[PDB]
Amino acid sequence: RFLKVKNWETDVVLTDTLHLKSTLETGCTEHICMGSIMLPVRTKDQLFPLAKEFLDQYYSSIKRFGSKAHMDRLEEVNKEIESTSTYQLKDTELIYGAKHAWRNASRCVGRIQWSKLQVFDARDCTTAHGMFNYICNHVKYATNKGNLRSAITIFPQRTDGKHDFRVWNSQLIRYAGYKQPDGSTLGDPANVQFTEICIQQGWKAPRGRFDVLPLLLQANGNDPELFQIPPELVLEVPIRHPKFDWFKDLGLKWYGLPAVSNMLLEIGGLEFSACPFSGWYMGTEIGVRDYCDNSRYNILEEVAKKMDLDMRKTSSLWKDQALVEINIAVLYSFQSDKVTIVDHHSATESFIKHMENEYRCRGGCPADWVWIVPPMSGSITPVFHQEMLNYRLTPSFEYQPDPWNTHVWKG
Amino acid sequence: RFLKVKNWETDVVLTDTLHLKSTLETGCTEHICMGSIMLPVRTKDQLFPLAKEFLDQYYSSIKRFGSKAHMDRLEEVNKEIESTSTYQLKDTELIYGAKHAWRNASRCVGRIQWSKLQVFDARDCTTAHGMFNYICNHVKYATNKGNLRSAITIFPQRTDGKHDFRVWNSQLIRYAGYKQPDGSTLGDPANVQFTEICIQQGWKAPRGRFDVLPLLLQANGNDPELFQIPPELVLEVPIRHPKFDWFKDLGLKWYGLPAVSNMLLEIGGLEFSACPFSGWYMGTEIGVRDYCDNSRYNILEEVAKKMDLDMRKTSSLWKDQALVEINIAVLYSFQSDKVTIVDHHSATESFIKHMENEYRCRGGCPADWVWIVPPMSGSITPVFHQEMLNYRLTPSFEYQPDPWNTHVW
Ligand code: HEM
Ligand code: HEM
Ligand SMILES: Cc1cc(N)nc(C[C@@H]2CNC[C@@H]2OCCNCC(F)(F)c2ccccc2Cl)c1
Ligand SMILES: Cc1cc(N)nc(C[C@@H]2CNC[C@@H]2OCCNCC(F)(F)c2ccccc2Cl)c1
Ligand SMILES: C[C@H](O)[C@H](O)[C@H]1CNc2nc(N)[nH]c(=O)c2N1
Ligand SMILES: C[C@H](O)[C@H](O)[C@H]1CNc2nc(N)[nH]c(=O)c2N1
Ligand SMILES: [Zn+2]
After folding, report:
1. Whose CA is nearest to atom 10 of ligand 6?
2. So where does heme b get bound (chain B)?
């Protein structure tokens, strides 16, 4: 079967066949679309087909499908599963697997970069201290003094689900948030609960507006342990504006390295519950979401005050005006400090070229329009006008619940 | 089976039960989501279940479900379908149906207004000239000297499908487009094909940038005929900016009345193929989409230049700056001329209030996030953070194919 998508700006029509390899469910049915819903232990029996599907894809990718090396590897993995109930990936398979999970990430606008990913194999790690060291090395490598390089570090896979490796932080680098007795928040309101956990585990909080959180690291199902990332490894950018010299005295800064650490990587039916990965920011993440969401740093009003905008009616579009200036400031600041960043026009134009390439080469590119379209200026980017098909390919990155909800405390 | 939606800004969680009454298909399957796809006669047998479903909801709404008058109406309609192969709605049913088709329009941010809709019953209309008269009256009533009022005008229902009433125009009021020897497009690029069909049918095109198109009306399945809307009934707004005095010199204007005329209204299985309806604009429709789409009037570059922004690199956000100013000018011009308009902040705020009302007293509100979130400044409006479930309820408005593909001359 064939599915077509149309671009309403260019009239370019693409044909998807790749969706035929989709397996997992979307949440949608013929009666209900759940496209805007954010969130819509394996047996030997379920595992071997998953392993086989993966190895088939890997061996096809290297043009060795059906070879003796292919057949011997299927055999070897089958025998490993029957005997030990799981199996180990070869390094080459792990690399291919991590790159493909990114390639298949339908919510990622940055996927033009998918084949350039440094994979750090941390499967020999056994303790939280070992995790800390791996993560420091990742941060220093990825940061590269501002010349950011994509990377992922992969800790040992799930076994019985009682021995999971987990990074409790949602991102490797994030600022603390502190709920005040008067109900106001100091720092990042998104991180209040997690900050509270760190404090309870014995973190001495500075209680400022941009305090880098400690890592809380769980190895082998053990209770997590706290570690401070060396501050010299945490590259930050003070935010200033090219024309407005008062912008600096807002006292804003942000960190250069966006590094998601709470997702689960599935390759061939194996589950890597700790697999922190990093790239570089698109500016709107910081300037639109982190700074301007009402339940984040929420700076729109203060910015618009300083610009002397008419604030008595929303129809002056004061919020939109202040939003654009904050985003100019984030891009200018990163660029001035030589820290990699991409603007939303750049990024979406590159995404459309990536997607067209994938359609030709691969027969499709699953994409989640709700996430791919930037949170400002949506329709002046080419992705707004592009129809997309969202479906689930493996290998994949998946959301998993926060570990504090599920962890069995050892004490 | 019962589904939850969460607002990620406010943590408010709502439970949707209304979706269990959805009938039509979404285009999504368990394997593929088609959320971003723009486009994803009835026999006696098919028609009675549809009539019954509708009449049940109707009698329910007036608190007379299972009453003698309920059973008596179901009886009458059944008899009428068996004998005539169709049936006629009572005026009360027609009004209820049209208001609910709007209530059910999952792509409409303006539904807080749904119960305030003036319904013009044009089911007695028989000719294209009659259609023109009804439409001018709609246009004049809805416009109301700039104090716009929501309205729909409903022409006769489909019969055997060879006698369709159709307004060939996509909206009652739109601007002509003409491809130039220059290679460029003069006017609205979106209307090139329709403008050509107009000329072919005899329209004397002025060949300007903002020429109000004539109506092309089809009655009783006949060949469509041309009429032009009295110029004094088409309220237009010249676009200026509260601070940039050069803005007026771009020569921009837009019309005050948005009036969709190409959709099909389905009520109780009955199909109203000509049912033009109108409300009032949300500013971004004109300022973001009409003015700044590549493929529309595409004015971003000209504005940016007059602002003397750095257009050398995308990262100066020159497009975004110019976008906001164009949208400030649209809103300012409509407000100064006392023509009803709503900004995207205010409209989305009232949709959230509407959603909560609908969850509270109906068990849900079908909504298409891809359409509800404005085409600029998405995440600084409250709808961006609101999970929505999209499903199809009847009565409904449905897209239908351009009739020039359908029609046999
Ligand atoms: C290289 C530069 C990259 C850019 C500019 C980029 C851009 C983005 C953006 C803007 C988002 C949405 C973020 C949000 O709203 O929270 C995203 C999502 C995502 N990206 Fe990327 N990306 C990059 C690299 C990567 C890498 C290296 C990976 C993994 C190997 C990755 C995998 C993902 C995944 C799984 C999501 C969905 C996250 C979620 O569900 O929270 N991306 N990307
Ligand atoms: C009262 C003021 C109204 C406002 C501010 C409003 C707002 C909007 C907006 C912004 C859209 C998206 C349009 C687009 O992007 O092309 C829309 C779509 C729509 N609205 Fe409304 N609306 C109003 C009245 C109405 C009325 C009176 C009806 C029917 C009686 C209606 C039914 C629809 C339908 C069916 C769509 C989807 C149209 C399509 O698929 O092209 N709306 N609404
Ligand atoms: C409920 C929920 C579900 C889900 N799947 N993800 C989230 C995370 C939510 C989704 N938007 C905010 C929060 O993520 C912030 C992280 N963004 C940074 C980045 F990693 F995505 C990234 C961005 C740019 C370049 C590279 C990278 Cl690795 C929340
Ligand atoms: C392929 C296609 C499918 C579809 N369902 N609709 C369209 C119409 C396409 C989709 N966006 C543009 C075009 O409509 C412009 C009409 N907008 C005016 C209005 F009616 F929507 C309206 C707006 C504001 C207030 C009231 C009203 Cl009644 C195209
Ligand atoms: C409810 C809705 O799905 C939610 O707010 C989404 C919308 N689109 C998004 N897009 C991106 N890139 N990141 C997000 O966090 C979200 N949030
Ligand atoms: C492909 C995508 O669905 C398309 O560009 C949509 C996106 N959202 C929209 N939203 C509204 N309100 N109107 C539109 O015309 C569109 N176009
Ligand atoms: Zn869907």
Report:
1. B371
2. 108, 399
Cα(B200) to centroid(ligand 3), Å: 54
The partner residue sitting opposite B388, judged by closest CB among A3, A36, A385, is A36
Ligand nearest to the CA of A29: 7
Torsion, Cα of A21, A27, A31, A35 (10° steps)? -100
**Beta bridge pairs of residue B302:** none
Place of tokens 């009458």: B76
Hey, are the CB atoms on A345 and B292 less than 8 Å from each other? no
Q: What is the resolution of this structure in A?
A: 1.9
The structure tokens 């070992």 sit at: A130
DSSP conformational letter for B285? I
CATH architecture for segment(s) B124-149+164-235+399-403: Alpha-Beta Complex (3.90)
Mutate which of A285, A390, A398, A402 for ligand 3? The one with the most ligand atoms within 8 Å of its CB, which is A285
Spell out where chain B is interrupted, by the residue before each break (C to N > 2.5 A): 40
Instruction: Determine, for residues A388 and B320 on separate chains, whether the beta-carbon distance falls below 8 Å.
Output: no
C-alpha closest to that of A347 among A139, A94, A118, A110: A110
Residue A44, amino acid: K
Give CA torsion, residues A20, A23, A27, A28, to 10 deg. Answer: 20
A274 strand-pairing partners: none
Give, as one character, the DSSP assignment of residue A327.
Answer: H
| Cβ of residue A282 lying under 6 Å from some atom of ligand 3 | yes
Question: A60 in helix, strand or coil?
Answer: helix
Q: How far apart are the C-alpha atoms of B350 and B381, rounded to whole Å?
A: 11
Please check whether residue A362 is in contact with residue A391, taking contact to mean a CB–CB distance below 8 angstroms: no
The pairing of beta strand B151-154 with beta strand A253-255 = unpaired
Tell me how far the alpha carbon of residue B381 is from its chain's centroid. 21
User: Helices H, strands E: what count in chain B?
Assistant: 12, 18
Among the listed residues B393, B403, B302, the one whose alpha carbon sits nearest the alpha carbon of residue B101: B393
User: How do the residues of chain B divide into helix, strand and coil, expressed in percent and rounded to 5?
Assistant: 40, 15, 45
Per-residue buried b or exposed e for A55-92, using 16+ beta carbons within 10 Å of the residue's own CB: bebbbeeeeeeeeeebeebbeebeeebeeeebbebeee
Please state, in angstroms and rounded to a whole number, the distance separating the CA atoms of residues B207 and A342.
43
A38 CB under 6 A from ligand 3?
yes
> Could you tell me which residues are beta bridge partners of residue A238?
A253
Name beta bridge partners: A341. Answer: A281
CA of A24 to the centre of ligand 4 (A): 34
| Peptide linkage before B395 cis (omega within 30 of 0) | yes
- A204-to-A214, A224, B122, B178 alpha-carbon distances in Å: 10, 17, 74, 70
For chain A, the distance separating the N- and C-terminal CA atoms, rounded to the nearest angstrom, is: 55
Method: X-ray
Quick one: which of A349, A333, A284, A295 has its CA closest to B320?
Answer: A284
CA distance A139 to A276: 10
Answer whether A163's CB lies under 8 Å from A221's CB. Answer: yes
Instruction: Return the domain boundaries, chain A.
Output: 16-123+150-160+264-278+348-372, 124-149+164-235+399-403, 236-258+281-346
Q: Exposed, middle or buried by CB within 10 Å (0-12, 13-18, 19+), for B74?
A: middle
State the closest ligand 3 atom to the C-alpha of A108, by its place in the atom list counted from 1: 21
Among B3, B19, B377, B393, most A C-beta atoms within 10 A, so best to mutate, is: B377
Class of domain A236-258+281-346: alpha beta
**Backbone torsion region of residue A364, taken as left when φ is above 0, otherwise alpha when ψ lies between -120 and 50, otherwise beta:** left
- Residue among A199, A162, A137, A214 at smallest CA distance from A403: A162
